Amino acid sequence: EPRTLPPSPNWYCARCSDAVPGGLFGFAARTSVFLVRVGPGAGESPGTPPFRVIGELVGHTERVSGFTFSHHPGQYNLCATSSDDGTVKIWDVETKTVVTEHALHQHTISTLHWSPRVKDLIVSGDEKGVVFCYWFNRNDSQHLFIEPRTIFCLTCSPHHEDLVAIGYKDGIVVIIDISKKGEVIHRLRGHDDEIHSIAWCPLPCYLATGSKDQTIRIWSCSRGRGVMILKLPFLKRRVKERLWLTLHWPSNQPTQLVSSCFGGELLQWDLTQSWRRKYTLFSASSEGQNHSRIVFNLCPLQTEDDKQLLLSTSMDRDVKCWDIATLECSWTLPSLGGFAYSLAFSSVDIGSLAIGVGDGMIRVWNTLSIKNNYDVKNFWQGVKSKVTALCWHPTKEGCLAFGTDDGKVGLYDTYSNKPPQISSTYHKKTVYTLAWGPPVPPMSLPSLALYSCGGEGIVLQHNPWKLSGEAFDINKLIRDTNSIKYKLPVHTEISWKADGKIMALGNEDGSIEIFQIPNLKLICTIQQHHKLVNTISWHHEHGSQPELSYLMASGSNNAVIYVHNLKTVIESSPESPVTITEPYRTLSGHTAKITSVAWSPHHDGRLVSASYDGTAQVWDALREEPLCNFRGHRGRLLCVAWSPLDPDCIYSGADDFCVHKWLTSMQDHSRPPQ
Numbered sequence: 225e226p227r228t229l230p231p232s233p234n235w236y237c238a239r240c241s242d243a244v245p246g247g248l249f250g251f252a253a254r255t256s257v258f259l260v261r262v263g264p265g266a267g268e269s270p271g272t273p274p275f276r277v278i279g280e281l282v283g284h285t286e287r288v289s290g291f292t293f294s295h296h297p298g299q300y301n302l303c304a305t306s307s308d309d310g311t312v313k314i315w316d317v318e319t320k321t322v323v324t325e326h327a328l329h330q331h332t333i334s335t336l337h338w339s340p341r342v343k344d345l346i347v348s349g350d351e352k353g354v355v356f357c358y359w360f361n362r363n364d365s366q367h368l369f370i371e372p373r374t375i376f377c378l379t380c381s382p383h384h385e386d387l388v389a390i391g392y393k394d395g396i397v398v399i400i401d402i403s404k405k406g407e408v409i410h411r412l413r414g415h416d417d418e419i420h421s422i423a424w425c426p427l428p429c430y431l432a433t434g435s436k437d438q439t440i441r442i443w444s445c446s447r448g449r450g451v452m453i454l455k456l457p458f459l460k461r462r463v464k465e466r467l468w469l470t471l472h473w474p475s476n477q478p479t480q481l482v483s484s485c486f487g488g489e490l491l492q493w494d495l496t497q498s499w500r501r502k503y504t505l506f507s508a509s510s511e512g513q514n515h516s517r518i519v520f521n522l523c524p525l526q527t528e529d530d531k532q533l534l535l536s537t538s539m540d541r542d543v544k545c546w547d548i549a550t551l552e553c554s555w556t557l558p559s560l561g562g563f564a565y566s567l568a569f570s571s572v573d574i575g576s577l578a579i580g581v582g583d584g585m586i587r588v589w590n591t592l593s594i595k596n597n598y599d600v601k602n603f604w605q606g607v608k609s610k611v612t613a614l615c616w617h618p619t620k621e622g623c624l625a626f627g628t629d630d631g632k633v634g635l636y637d638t639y640s641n642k643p644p645q646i647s648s649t650y651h652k653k654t655v656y657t658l659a660w661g662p663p664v665p666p667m668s669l670p671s672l673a674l675y676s677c678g679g680e681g682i683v684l685q686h687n688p689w690k691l692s693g694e695a696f697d698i699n700k701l702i703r704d705t706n707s708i709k710y711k712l713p714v715h716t717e718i719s720w721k722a723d724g725k726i727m728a729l730g731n732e733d734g735s736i737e738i739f740q741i742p743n744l745k746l747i748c749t750i751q752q753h754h755k756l757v758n759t760i761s762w763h764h765e766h767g768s769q770p771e772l773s774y775l776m777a778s779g780s781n782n783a784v785i786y787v788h789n790l791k792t793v794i795e796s797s798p799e800s801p802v803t804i805t806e807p808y809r810t811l812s813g814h815t816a817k818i819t820s821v822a823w824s825p826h827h828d829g830r831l832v833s834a835s836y837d838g839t840a841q842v843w844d845a846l847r848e849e850p851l852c853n854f855r856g857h858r859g860r861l862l863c864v865a866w867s868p869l870d871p872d873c874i875y876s877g878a879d880d881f882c883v884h885k886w887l888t889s890m891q892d893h894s895r896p897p898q
């Protein structure tokens with residue numbers, strides 16, 4: 225399996241993640257459940273954090289709203305999910321397949337719980353207050369209804385196999401007996417708002433409830449009354465955001481109770497110090513290890529080497545693992561909240577990978593961290609909208625160019641906390657391409673200019689030193705230099721040659737026009753593609769044969785990839801432009817549009833391509849031979865990038881909300897699926 229940057233855990237679900245001893249962690253994300261092996265079984269270096277994304281539960285067609293592991297010894301491999309598609313599925317995580325399922329619910333399911341006491345019991349509840357009890361082994365059921373209120377959470381008793389606690393949207397908490405046709409045994413009034421979490425005392429009774437009303441309440445089953453009220457402290461920061469108050473009652477420390485707080489802070493409440501309402505802040509000493517937005521779920525995981533771990537899911541899109549013994553953050557697994565549109569490695573900071581995501585946050589992945597496989601920085605300043613284009617500055621470290629789907633073009637400094645400069649001139653459509661190169665008139669009359677291409681077909685030339693100034697339409701220069709009466713084509717791609725002496729423009733009609741410095745004289749037009757040009761890449765200038773740097777790969781809405789050698793036509797320097805209609809090489813194999821191509825900086829004529837067919841293909845372009853096909857993604861690939869340091873390592877991003885880091889040598893398939 226490849227190293228994976230997963231989709232964000234789902235929000236506002238009382239229980240859409242869970243863990244089992246060993247062990248294995250699973251979290252709902254969009255329509256799937258992603259499994260994470262944690263501990264010795266993850267197979268990681270003694271330095272790097274002991275975890276790894278190993279699998280995915282695929283089958284649901286709508287949002288997964290609930291997830292629960294079977295905590296019965298021997299059946300830690302069984303789990304259950306709930307979905308907005310109306311179904312409850314039982315899974316086998318070792319085969320990622322569905323054992324059995326049901327669709328008994330007639331309304332949108334809220335959550336579900338695997339009974340801690342009965343091997344095959346799974347209780348679920350929907351937003352009309354309907355509860356189904358499901359025994360999957362003998363395929364039995366029990367339609368129940370308690371109160372005409374929206375169910376938010378439910379938790380089976382770990383001690384009594386017939387007791388189930390249910391929390392509602394209005395603050396009502398009930399404990400029912402499922403053997404007595406769902407009779408309300410206790411009715412707990414006190415909360416004024418949504419119940420988010422319900423935890424029973426691990427010792428055989430007491431139970432704790434967490435609510436949006438900022439209070440935690442401990443109740444006694446004997447008296448059916450509340451014995452303790454814990455209100456959240458108004459702590460200091462370390463934006464209108466509502467609270468989510470979830471709980472964990474550690475079986476090791478029955479006198480302690482873990483909860484979330486404002487801003488995603490985690491708290492450990494000492495219940496013996498009742499009147500003192502004494503708590504301890506998680507990672508109280510260290511800064512920046514804590515979540516920055518609210519926490520939704522908490523899952524206890526004891527590893528095989530007896531480590532007490534706690535996993536948290538958050539709105540800040542991080543998944544964190546805490547050591548309960550120290551209350552410190554062991555590690556962090558970042559996640560994506562949208563499409564992975566662009567990938568770009570810096571030529572200055574060689575291992576620095578920038579990721580353009582559809583949730584309005586730029587990720588910078590330090591792929592060279594020895595102690596951390598997921599060293600990822602977030603940048604949300606002045607972005608908001610989807611980042612659809614990225615390009616590092618070629619010489620200035622920490623300077624990143626970015627473009628958004630609403631036509632914005634910006635300059636972000638990642639070494640500092642300076643707000644990004646936003647260009648005044650913007651495109652009427654999505655910025656699909658950015659490129660650095662030598663400034664052309666009128667700008668040249670800065671060392672490098674930032675070029676941006678938008679969906680409307682305009683390519684703007686930006687000034688780095690004066691971003692708020694006026695960006696120039698290069699069509700105004702092309703029209704004059706090459707003397708063109710009729711209108712110019714819709715540009716869809718821009719790619720500079722390595723020497724900065726040649727700029728290539730791809731168009732909606734499928735043609736690629738070849739211009740040259742300093743006035744963009746049209747010396748060549750490639751008529752090969754008959755559909756919109758998506759991507760163009762020039763070969764690097766440090767191959768065995770320096771004549772390789774005249775090779776140009778291109779991808780369009782057709783599945784066929786073309787390579788064109790431009791040694792002759794460029795070195796001939798024709799005053800009359802030349803039309804080329806023959807490919808120097810041809811790469812067939814993909815079955816859908818090509819979104820991205822890139823040359824390996826480690827080899828000669830080795831190309832990687834990203835396609836809507838759901839795969840990435842590695843070619844030996846010179847011999848037109850497919851080498852390996854990566855099929856890890858479940859969606860359509862939007863971008864691909866070669867590791868600058870490892871010749872065997874490639875990164876890819878798709879609309880499945882995933883970035884995969886994979887090895888060419890580990891791929892069994894050689895060509896795309898047919």
Ligand SMILES: C[n+]1cn([C@@H]2O[C@H](COP(=O)(O)OP(=O)(O)O)[C@@H](O)[C@H]2O)c2nc(N)[nH]c(=O)c21
Nearest residue numbers: 565656657678679715716717757758759819862
């Ligand atoms: C219009 N357009 C679409 N793409 C590619 O196609 C993806 C999305 O294309 P889309 O038109 O936004 O939606 P659709 O193709 O699924 O119907 C983007 O992530 C790009 O990789 C494009 N890529 C480039 N370079 N230029 C373009 O004008 C362009």
